[PDB]
Ligand SMILES: *[C@H]1O[C@H](CO)[C@@H](O[C@@H]2O[C@H](CO)[C@@H](O[C@@H]3O[C@H](CO)[C@@H](O)[C@H](O)[C@@H]3O)[C@H](O)[C@@H]2O)[C@H](O)[C@@H]1F
């Protein structure tokens with residue numbers, strides 16, 4: 001039965017429209033599991049060619065949603081090319097999302113002492129990157145590369161692969177150059193809209209859904225979410241990002257459910273897809289060797305009990321760094337099939353999350369891209 005869909009890109013491909021329609025239906029029957037660098041980074045994988053994952057080694061299926069970043073698209077591509085791995089995910093019927101950790105357009109020639117020139121260079125660069133600003137050509141260069149990548153991202157039949165493109169995330173904090181100390185709300189909205197327009201209208205991208213993803217709010221109100229929201233004409237997917245404590249985390253879990261309930265209600269009202277774009281125990285706690293061996297069970301229990309929060313399409317957790325990060329210390333979110341996670345109880349926790357009938361992994365999602373739609 002054909003369903004009516006209103007996307008940011010009114011000329012989006014049939015498969016991109018189908019992805020939107022798929023999640024609109026699926027989200028009231030399950031929550032899909034997502035994982036950043038699902039088949040490109042893992043503690044237990046022996047090849048990074050797109051055929052293995054820590055998730056698969058833990059539970060016997062891949063994540064449903066595969067996350068990557070513009071760090072694998074825009075020069076200098078610090079995280080490496082991902083075209084092959086995206087194609088393998090798509091061939092398996094998976095869903096692809098890409099976040100944007102864009103370099104700082106005002107300071108990217110100055111790289112040398114981290115974090116200078118990167119997303120984490122807090123030098124405000126929104127005003128100077130919009131048209132009229134001195135560094136607008138630098139931002140355009142990044143968007144040119146994103147567009148070239150998208151416009152050539154084709155399956156084995158030569159049809160474009162849809163991607164959920166999550167732009168300028170975590171914008172209600174100030175650790176990125178597009179954040180809340182770096183821009184007024186209007187300036188941030190202009191950056192988001194300019195960038196979507198550039199991709200869609202100037203460069204002709206037809207295979208994106210656009211996602212907005214602020215941090216979780218502690219005062220959970222529609223008005224707060226709306227302050228930097230780019231608008232219904234500019235966003236397909238309403239998300240948020242949240243990282244919490246490894247211990248004494250009941251209040252934080254209640255806050256996860258509240259923010260999810262808010263985006264779910266807003267999304268129904270506005271014809272959007274609600275998601276949790278990024279969720280995890282905070283990296284510093286994981287890096288200290290700490291664990292919560294009930295974390296995944298608490299997550300799915302809390303979300304599915306709430307009549308609104310359960311309606312999110314997916315939740316995504318961050319990357320499983322194969323050798324950790326420089327203290328080397330651990331930096332991973334999917335419990336791996338290895339002695340450490342067997343002994344501390346985290347692998348059992350994740351297997352229980354997988355077993356839960358409301359979670360959806362890659363074999364649980366079918367005919368994502370062949371659903372008929374009208375505009
Ligand atoms: C949401 O929050 C996450 C948890 O705080 C953040 O994770 C970070 O992600 C970035 C991007 O993947 C990682 O940084 C990269 O690391 C690469 C390998 O070291 C390097 O090539 C890149 O240039 C970049 O530094 C980082 O270690 C961490 O995992 C993230 O912000 C996410 F959106």
Ligand SMILES: O=[N+]([O-])c1cccc([N+](=O)[O-])c1
Pocket residue numbers: 175243
């Ligand atoms: O800087 N980050 O990339 C980042 C990511 C996730 C969370 C937080 N945080 O809470 O400050 C920061």
Ligand code: NA
Pocket residue numbers: 026027028029030031032309310311312313314
């Ligand atoms: Na759901």
Ligand SMILES: [Zn+2]
Pocket residue numbers: 025028029
């Ligand atoms: Zn239904």
Ligand SMILES: [Zn+2]
Pocket residue numbers: 099169170213241277278
């Ligand atoms: Zn994010």
